[PDB]
């Protein structure tokens, strides 16, 4: 329903937004633990 | 050297196996009064007519009653607040028909606990302790008082004071609940919450001081012999039992100062007390707990109940029986 | 320790005190038989609770 | 004292954590009130609006009396 | 290195929130009945089960909100998601009150996986098990009265409600129809939890009353370290206090401690053997001597035949709207009540 | 009624039988194991972090 | 067969305090139920 | 009758009281 | 009071019966 | 007339509390033990044993 | 068959699936990358 | 340099998470009106 | 009591008394599953013995009869006494098979260490555990009614009020 | 009745005065610390 | 029978009461 | 004034055989007289 659509969109951008600003060191720590 | 001197020093002393102190001058008499008459009129005491209307209850174990239902009944809502002692009536079957020992057992049992407390202070002033033990034990007077002499003055009759008894006390909390919706005030939630947690607290450090004690017995023995009375060294590791409740919650919800513990213990229940005795003693002058009655309406306006609403019916029936002899006006306005 | 005749005929039923096999042993076996114990238990508690309706019988006084 | 992981206060005080928490708590925020504003939450748990508590056929307290079978009830119930 | 050594390995690391086997089956089931409580109290309705708005949705406050017990009509089904009355839809699950067995039954294997972690923790820590012992009175509670109690009564509808007013609509029922303050089992109850309450206060204050002089500022909290020998304060000093003030008093220590859990953890036992008994109408409801005198001598009065009319007053005007499922139509006329009032 | 105390009783004697080593007590050490993140498993004392 | 004695034959101590414990629990337990066994 | 047996559950519990406080046992710092 | 014709006897034996028990075991200790 | 005086009996009791407070912490202020007990000069190691 | 017993059967197959297998799967991998170096 | 992601991460996550949704939805429900 | 020091009681090795309580274990769970299968084989099917107490839905018709053993799925129905037979029958077997394995395969390593098997106090743990397990069924099944709690020995149950049980039934 | 109205009022007062002359009785000074005040 | 509804707490007692006397002195016998 | 210990105090003793014909004899005495508490 669009109402889903609305409501799951800020999740994605909270998400998305943490993602950009962390995923550099998130993919770091990856590494750094195989 | 003097006489008087001599009673000071014998009175103060603190090595008489009770200690008396000057506060003990007043609470032993008054006690010792109280209790004699609160025997002696549970066992015997003729019927009371509480409510006035020439109803007598029977609250003595001769008439009737049982432990459970036996009680001191309050003195006439016709005597109100006026004080009432035995040479204020034509004769003892006078007073006692009236209620006469429980005013004469309340009064000087509130004597006696505002000097027990005031003796509290005396002898840990006499034995060069820190002076707050006194402070912990005004929780449980204020409660006392609360019931006993303020929700009295505050409803105007000593006929609303909570009776001597174990039913009586029944019927007091649950008449108090049906006019003044005792559970829903928030200061009886403190209370809840004080003695819960009180009871939760004392099982958490009982348990968790038996848990770390060191070992210091054999499998034969109670390990309460691996204490010494008076021993300079601690029975049980603080530290082991820190490293077990900061890893059951998270290190930072464990205390690992006995002070800062122990005061929390002592803190936690007093606190709650006072609310609750606080709110006893405010629902004195009729501010009750929360109404939520149709508190919710749909958009018609039609009431929708909650759990608040079927409390209230709860309370309504306890209300509209109580004291059923009692009332001739519409509205109980005390 | 005194000996009995009954004692002497019951010694090697009480004889091997302790003795394991090393490690894991018949322990896999042993959840297996465990789990399918615990879908048994599931399968007679909803029959009684109601919560599983079989055919060809009622949960009921009658059969 | 430490078990491995960073310091709550030094993860608070940090500019990175506030970048981050400066974005996804307001979003949080708004996806709940949203969830409540669009009318979803009635949806999704059943719960009646305030206009349908009652309906023309029925004044009373939609109370469940089947065993089993509560779609059709509820469906009646309206 | 096997995988269940491996595995038993990091999940009993010493991290922030410790884990252990425990973990596996305390934390999701806590979890589950958690968010089911903050789920139901937020959004879900009781409108279909006992005719009440039971969320912050429909207009409660935190005061009124529950998690309401489910419809009479299903007796005790555990009103699985799947089960043959929701069948998996999850709206209906919702209105049918399915969150109360949910919240109750993840609740009980939290509880369950609580007791657990106190246990796994209390022999990795190498302390004796008190702390797991003491707390099998809250699982008494709880076992008792969210699951004994509505299993020997009708239904789950019986059952408490997971909310502050259901709770308190709970306690009024028990005093009305089962006359629970009468019970001796819930006397002793009484006096478990608040004597609890008062050792509580008293060995905190007593403790912090006789404390020694251990440095020179006035704030006494900053004269303790964790791993000193010496005994923080006088227990021959609280002892003579208490001896004298009280007629006795504390001497060991130990048998103290044990006090402070023995007292509540009993009086949580005791109680939770009373409501047992209320799960069967095992009622200490009556004493037949007041009541066959009463009948037979217009006279006599008691606290007691006060209470027994109180108790009659409440069912009377309580049922129709708490059991609304039973269609009580119990006319004005028929109401006891009092003279005016 | 019984089926609940005996609840207590199996926690009792399940407690007995695991704990039977410090049923008298515990160690006059545990003033190093017991500390947080000195080792990476809690009571391990081959996990020494040295750090 | 003989009658051996046994070693396992260990003492049962009551304390004083434990005395007055458990006579006060006795006291009140009675007084508790007591109104309910006349009923 | 059951008068009776209330003040003698009474009376004892009073006197187990003023046992343990008249004739306790004496603690001693050893 | 038309009481359980039971009552006295238990009440008397709820309280004597472990009340024998405690006195027996505090007389005995020390032997 | 009850906010007034429901107020002023919560308040006249607090300020009951912090009289035994003050004063029961300026009498041992004053004679020097409000920080606690001396170790060495312990009152009742000094007193006979009450029985 | 019955609807009933259709939902019991599907109930122990998604529990397994949703919670108990991807939990120990998880849980091994996770133990297993992660390990405690003596 | 302590590690970003770990198991206390996601035991505050999985409470502060739905918290915030929850408060919001409150939040939005103190302007419902009959 | 008297003769205590019985030689069986002690380790042949060692001098102290030992019980190896897995070899216990296997002899009395294989002896109470012969007394289980003789039980519903014999007694409950009145191939030797009397049967059991069964009756009519309404108990008006109470007797003591042989019962053959339900097999099908409505064993697991508790109102039906052939599944209290076929059950005897069945979980008698498995303890003798059960009995059978415990008295062969010693215990593993990890879980003779983990259970403490060398003492006797973790019997005495798991034993109250099965045995208030037990008594919460039979609580259970006597309340809600069972083939084995028939209303013509207990009295009639209180669901059977509270549905109208037998009101109906007289309509 | 009278008689037994002296007599409280003569017991209260005595009490009262000995509680009151008690603590005038230079208290402060009855303490195991310092007494010179 | 319409027996004295006295005669058993009175029985129990009459053998009660001399019975524990004894029992206390035995037990308590070597200390 | 002091508290002083009592050397009059003398242990008292009872032994098996007194014992047995003491609970014989109360026995013996219930038997006999238990017929006429009842009446
Ligand atoms: C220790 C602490 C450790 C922590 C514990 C945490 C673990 C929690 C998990 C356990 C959950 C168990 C839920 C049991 C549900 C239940 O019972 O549900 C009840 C069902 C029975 O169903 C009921 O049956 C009743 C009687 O029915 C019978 O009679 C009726 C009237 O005549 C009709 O004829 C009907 O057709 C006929 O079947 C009514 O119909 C009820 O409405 C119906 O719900 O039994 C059943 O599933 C199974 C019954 C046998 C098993 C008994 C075990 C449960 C113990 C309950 C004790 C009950 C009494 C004690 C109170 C004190
Ligand atoms: C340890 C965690 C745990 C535990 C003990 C429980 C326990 C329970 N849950 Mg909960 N649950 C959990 C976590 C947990 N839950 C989580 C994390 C969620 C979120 C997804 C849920 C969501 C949830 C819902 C929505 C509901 C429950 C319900 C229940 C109850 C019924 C369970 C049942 O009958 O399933 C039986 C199933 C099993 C025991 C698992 C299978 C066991 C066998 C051995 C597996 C067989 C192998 C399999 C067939 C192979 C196929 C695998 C596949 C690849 C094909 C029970 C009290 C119900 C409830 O509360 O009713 C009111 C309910 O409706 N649970
Ligand atoms: C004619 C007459 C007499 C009329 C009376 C009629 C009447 C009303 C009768 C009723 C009387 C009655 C007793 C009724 C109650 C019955 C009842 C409900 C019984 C419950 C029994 C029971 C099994 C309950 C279960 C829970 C339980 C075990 C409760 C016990 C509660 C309890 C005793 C708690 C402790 C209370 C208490 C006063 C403790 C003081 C301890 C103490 C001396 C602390 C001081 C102290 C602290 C320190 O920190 C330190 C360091 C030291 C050194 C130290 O010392
Ligand atoms: C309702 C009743 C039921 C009871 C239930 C509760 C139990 C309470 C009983 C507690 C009393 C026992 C104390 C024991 C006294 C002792 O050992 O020494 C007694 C000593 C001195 O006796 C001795 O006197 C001796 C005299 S001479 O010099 O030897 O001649 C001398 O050696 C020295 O002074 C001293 O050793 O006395 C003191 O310690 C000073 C005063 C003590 C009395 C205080 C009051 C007692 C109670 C009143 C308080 C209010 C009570 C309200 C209701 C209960
Ligand atoms: C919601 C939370 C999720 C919960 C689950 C989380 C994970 C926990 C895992 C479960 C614990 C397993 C039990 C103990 C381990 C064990 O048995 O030994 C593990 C053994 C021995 O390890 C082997 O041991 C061998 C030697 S020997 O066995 O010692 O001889 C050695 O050679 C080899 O390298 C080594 O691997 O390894 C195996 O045999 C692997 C299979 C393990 C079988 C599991 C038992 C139960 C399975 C059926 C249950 C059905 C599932 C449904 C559940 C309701
Ligand atoms: C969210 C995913 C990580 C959550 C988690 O379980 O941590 C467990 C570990 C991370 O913490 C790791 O695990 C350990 C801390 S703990 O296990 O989380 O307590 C720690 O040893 C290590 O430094 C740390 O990197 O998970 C990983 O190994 C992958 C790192 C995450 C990379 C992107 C996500
Ligand atoms: C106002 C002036 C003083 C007057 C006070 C009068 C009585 C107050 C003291 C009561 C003595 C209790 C003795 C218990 C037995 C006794 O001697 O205990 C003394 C005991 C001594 O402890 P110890 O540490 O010395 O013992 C350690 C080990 O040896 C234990 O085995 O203290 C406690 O256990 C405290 C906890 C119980 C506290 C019980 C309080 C209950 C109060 C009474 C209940 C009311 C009943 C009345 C019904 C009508
Ligand atoms: C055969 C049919 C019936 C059998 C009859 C025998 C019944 C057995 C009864 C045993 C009595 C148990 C009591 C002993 C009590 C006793 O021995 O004292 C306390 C005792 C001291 O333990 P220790 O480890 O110090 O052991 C020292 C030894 O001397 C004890 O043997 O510990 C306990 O027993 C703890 C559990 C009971 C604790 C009870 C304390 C509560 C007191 C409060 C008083 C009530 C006031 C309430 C006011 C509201
Ligand atoms: C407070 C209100 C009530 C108080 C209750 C206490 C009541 C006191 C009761 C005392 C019990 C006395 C019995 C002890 C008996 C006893 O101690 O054993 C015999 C006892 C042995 O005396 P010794 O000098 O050897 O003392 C050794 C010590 O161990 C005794 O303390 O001597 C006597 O007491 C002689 C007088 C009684 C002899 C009675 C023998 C008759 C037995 C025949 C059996 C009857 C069969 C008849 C068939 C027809
Ligand atoms: C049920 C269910 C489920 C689950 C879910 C979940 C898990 C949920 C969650 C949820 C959640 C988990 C949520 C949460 C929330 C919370 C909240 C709602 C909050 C609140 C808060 C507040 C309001 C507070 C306040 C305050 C105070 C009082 C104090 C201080 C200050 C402050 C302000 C902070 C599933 C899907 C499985 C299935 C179906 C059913
Ligand atoms: C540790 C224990 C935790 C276990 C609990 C965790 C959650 C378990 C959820 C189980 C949900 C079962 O829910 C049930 O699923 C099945 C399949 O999806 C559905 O089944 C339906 O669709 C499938 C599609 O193939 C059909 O085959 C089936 O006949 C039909 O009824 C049910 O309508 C639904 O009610
Ligand atoms: C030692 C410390 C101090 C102690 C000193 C106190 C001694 C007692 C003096 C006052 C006690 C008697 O006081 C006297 O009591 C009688 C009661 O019969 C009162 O009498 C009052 O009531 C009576 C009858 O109830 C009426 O007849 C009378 O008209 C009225 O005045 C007097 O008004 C009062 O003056
Ligand atoms: O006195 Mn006792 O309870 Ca106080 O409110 Mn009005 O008055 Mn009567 O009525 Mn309700
Ligand atoms: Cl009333
Ligand atoms: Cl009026
Ligand atoms: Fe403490």
């Given at each position: 329903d669009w109402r889903v659509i609305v409501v799951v969109s800020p999740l994605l951008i909270a998400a998305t937004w943490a993602a950009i600003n962390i995923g550099a060191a998130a993919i770091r720590q990856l590494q750094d633990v195989l | 050297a003097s006489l008087w001197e001599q009673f000071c020093q014998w009175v103060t002393?603190?090595?008489?196996?009770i200690y008396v102190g000057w506060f003990g001058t007043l609470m032993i008499p008054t006690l010792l009064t109280a209790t004699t008459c609160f025997i002696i009129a549970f066992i015997a005491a003729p019927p009371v007519d509480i409510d006035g209307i020439r109803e007598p209850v029977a609250g003595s174990?001769?008439?009737?009653?049982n432990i459970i239902s036996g009680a001191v009944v309050p003195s006439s809502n016709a005597i109100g607040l006026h004080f009432y002692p035995?040479?204020?009536?034509?004769?003892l079957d006078e007073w006692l028909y009236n209620g006469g020992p429980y005013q004469l057992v309340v009064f000087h049992f509130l004597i006696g606990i505002f000097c027990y407390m005031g003796r509290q202070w005396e002898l840990s002033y006499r034995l060069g302790m820190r002076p707050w033990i006194c402070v912990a034990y005004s929780a449980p007077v204020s409660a006392a008082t609360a019931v006993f002499l303020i929700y009295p003055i505050g409803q105007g009759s000593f006929s609303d004071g909570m009776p001597l008894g174990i039913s009586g006390t029944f019927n007091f909390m649950i008449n108090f609940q049906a006019e003044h919706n005792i559970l829903m005030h928030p200061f009886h939630m403190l209370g809840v919450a004080g003695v819960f947690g009180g009871s939760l607290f004392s099982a958490m450090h009982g348990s968790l001081v038996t848990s770390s004690?060191?070992?210091?017995?054999?499998?034969?023995?109670?390990?309460?012999?691996?204490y010494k009375f008076?021993?300079?060294?601690?029975?049980?590791?603080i530290v082991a039992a820190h490293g077990y409740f900061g890893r059951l919650i998270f290190?930072?919800?464990?205390?690992?100062?006995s002070r800062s513990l122990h005061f929390f213990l002592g803190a936690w229940p007093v606190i709650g007390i006072w609310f609750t005795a606080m709110g006893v003693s405010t629902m004195a002058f009729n501010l009750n707990g929360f109404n939520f009655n149709q508190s919710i309406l749909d958009s018609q306006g039609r009431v929708i109940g909650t759990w608040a609403d079927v409390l209230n019916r709860a309370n309504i029936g306890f209300e509209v029986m109580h004291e059923r002899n009692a009332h001739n006006f519409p509205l109980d306005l005390a | 320790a005194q000996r009995t005749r009954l004692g002497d005929i019951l010694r090697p039923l009480n004889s091997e005190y302790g003795k394991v096999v090393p490690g894991w042993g018949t322990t896999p076996v042993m959840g297996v038989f465990m789990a399918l114990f615990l879908v048994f238990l599931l399968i007679i508690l909803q029959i009684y609770n109601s919560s599983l309706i079989l055919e060809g019988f009622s949960v009921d006084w009658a059969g | 004292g430490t078990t491995g992981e960073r310091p709550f206060s030094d993860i608070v005080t940090s500019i990175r954590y506030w970048v981050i928490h400066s974005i996804t708590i307001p979003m949080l925020f708004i996806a709940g009130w949203l969830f409540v504003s669009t009318g979803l939450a009635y949806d999704a748990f059943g719960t009646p609006r305030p206009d349908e508590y009652f309906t023309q056929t029925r004044q009373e307290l939609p109370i469940l009396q089947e065993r089993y079978d509560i779609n059709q009830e509820i469906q009646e119930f309206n | 290195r096997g995988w269940f050594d491996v595995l038993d390995d990091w999940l009993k690391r010493d991290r922030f929130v410790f884990i252990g086997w425990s973990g596996l089956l305390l934390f999701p089931c806590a979890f589950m009945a958690l968010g089911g409580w903050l789920t139901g109290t937020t959004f879900v309705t009781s409108?279909?089960?006992?005719?009440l708005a039971s969320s912050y949705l429909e207009g409660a406050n935190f005061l009124t909100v529950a998690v309401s017990s489910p419809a009479?009509?299903?007796?005790?089904?555990?009103?699985?998601?799947?089960?043959?009355?929701?069948?998996?839809?999850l709206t209906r699950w919702f209105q049918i009150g399915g969150l109360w067995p949910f919240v109750a039954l993840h609740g009980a294997f939290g509880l369950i996986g609580f007791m657990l972690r106190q246990f796994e923790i209390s022999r990795l820590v190498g302390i004796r098990p008190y702390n797991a012992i003491a707390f099998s009175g809250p699982i008494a509670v709880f076992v008792s009265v969210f699951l004994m109690y509505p299993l020997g009564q009708s239904?789950?509808?019986?059952a408490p409600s997971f909310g502050v007013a259901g709770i308190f609509r709970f306690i009024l029922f028990l005093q009305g129809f089962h006359n629970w303050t009468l019970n001796p089992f819930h006397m002793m109850g009484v006096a478990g939890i608040l004597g609890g309450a008062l050792l509580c206060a008293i060995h905190g204050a007593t403790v912090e009353n006789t404390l020694?002089?251990?440095?020179?500022?006035?704030?006494?909290?900053?004269?303790?370290?964790?791993?000193?020998?010496?005994?923080?304060?006088s227990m021959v000093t609280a002892n003579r206090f208490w001896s004298q003030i009280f007629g006795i008093a504390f001497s060991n220590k130990r048998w103290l401690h044990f006090f402070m859990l023995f007292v509540p953890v009993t009086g949580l036992w005791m109680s939770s053997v009373g409501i047992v008994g209320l799960a069967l109408?095992?009622?200490?409801?009556?004493?037949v001597s007041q009541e066959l005198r009463a009948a037979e001598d217009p006279e006599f009065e008691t606290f007691y035949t006060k209470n027994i009319l109180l108790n009659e007053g409440m069912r009377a005007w309580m049922a129709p709207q708490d059991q609304?499922?039973?269609?009580?139509?119990?006319?004005?006329?028929v109401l006891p009540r009092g003279n005016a009032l | 009624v019984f089926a609940l105390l005996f609840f207590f009783g199996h926690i009792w004697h399940g407690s007995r039988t695991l704990f039977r080593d410090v049923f008298a007590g515990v160690?006059?050490?545990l003033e190093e194991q017991v500390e947080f993140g000195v080792f990476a498993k809690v009571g391990d004392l081959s996990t020494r972090k040295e750090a | 067969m003989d009658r051996n004695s046994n070693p396992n034959r260990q003492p049962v101590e009551l304390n004083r305090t434990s005395l007055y414990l458990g006579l006060l629990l006795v006291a009140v337990l009675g007084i508790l139920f007591s109104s309910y066994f006349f009923n | 009758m059951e008068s009776v047996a209330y003040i003698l559950v009474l009376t004892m519990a009073l006197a187990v009281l003023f046992f343990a406080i008249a004739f306790r046992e004496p603690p001693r710092i050893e | 009071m038309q009481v359980n014709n039971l009552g006295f006897i238990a009440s008397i034996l709820f309280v004597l019966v472990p009340t024998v028990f405690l006195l027996i075991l505090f007389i005995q200790t020390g032997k | 007339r009850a906010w007034l005086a429901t107020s002023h009996f919560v308040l006249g009791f607090f300020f009951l509390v912090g009289h035994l407070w003050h004063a029961g912490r300026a009498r041992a202020a004053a004679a020097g033990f409000e920080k606690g007990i001396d170790r060495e000069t312990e009152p009742t190691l000094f007193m006979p044993d009450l029985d | 068959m019955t609807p009933s017993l259709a939902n019991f059967l599907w109930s122990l197959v998604l529990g397994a699936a949703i919670v108990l297998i991807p939990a120990t799967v998880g849980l091994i991998f996770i133990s297993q990358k992660d390990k405690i170096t003596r | 340099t302590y590690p970003i992601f770990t198991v206390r991460w996601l035991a505050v996550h999985t409470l502060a998470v739905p918290s915030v949704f929850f408060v919001g939805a409150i939040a939005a429900m103190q302007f419902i009106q009959r | 009591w008297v003769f205590w020091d019985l030689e069986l009681f002690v380790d042949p090795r060692t001098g102290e008394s030992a019980l190896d309580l897995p070899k216990m274990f296997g002899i009395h769970l294989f002896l109470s599953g012969l007394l289980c299968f003789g039980f519903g084989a014999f007694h409950l099917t009145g191939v030797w013995g009397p049967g059991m107490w069964v009756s009519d839905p309404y108990g008006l018709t109470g007797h003591v009869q042989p019962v053959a053993p339900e097999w099908?799925?409505?064993?697991?129905?508790?109102?039906?006494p052939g599944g209290v037979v076929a059950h005897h029958i069945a979980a008698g077997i498995v303890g003798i098979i059960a009995g059978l394995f415990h008295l062969t395969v010693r215990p593993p390593e990890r879980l003779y260490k983990a259970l403490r098997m060398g003492n006797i106090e973790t019997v005495l743990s798991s034993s109250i555990a099965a045995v208030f397990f037990a008594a919460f069924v039979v609580a259970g099944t006597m309340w809600y009614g069972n083939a084995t709690t028939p209303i013509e020995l207990f009295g009639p149950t209180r669901y059977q009020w509270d549905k109208g049980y037998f009101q109906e039934e007289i309509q | 009745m009278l008689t037994l109205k002296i007599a409280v009022y003569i017991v209260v007062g005595l009490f009262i005065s000995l509680f009151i002359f008690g603590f005038l009785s230079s208290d402060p000074t009855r303490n195991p610390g310092r007494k010179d005040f």
């Open positions: - | 002393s603190t090595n008489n196996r174990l001769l008439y009737g009653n035995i040479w204020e009536a034509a004769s004690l060191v070992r210091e017995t054999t499998e034969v023995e109670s390990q309460n012999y691996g008076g021993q300079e060294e601690e029975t049980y590791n290190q930072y919800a464990s205390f690992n100062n | - | - | 409108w279909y089960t006992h005719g009479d009509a299903f007796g005790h089904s555990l009103l699985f998601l799947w089960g043959p009355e929701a069948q998996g839809n239904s789950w509808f019986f020694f002089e251990d440095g020179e500022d006035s704030n006494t909290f900053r004269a303790f370290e964790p791993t000193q020998a010496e005994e923080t304060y109408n095992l009622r200490a409801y009556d004493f609304p499922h039973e269609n009580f139509i119990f006319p004005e006329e | 160690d006059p050490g | - | - | - | - | - | - | 099908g799925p409505a064993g697991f129905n508790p109102f039906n | -």
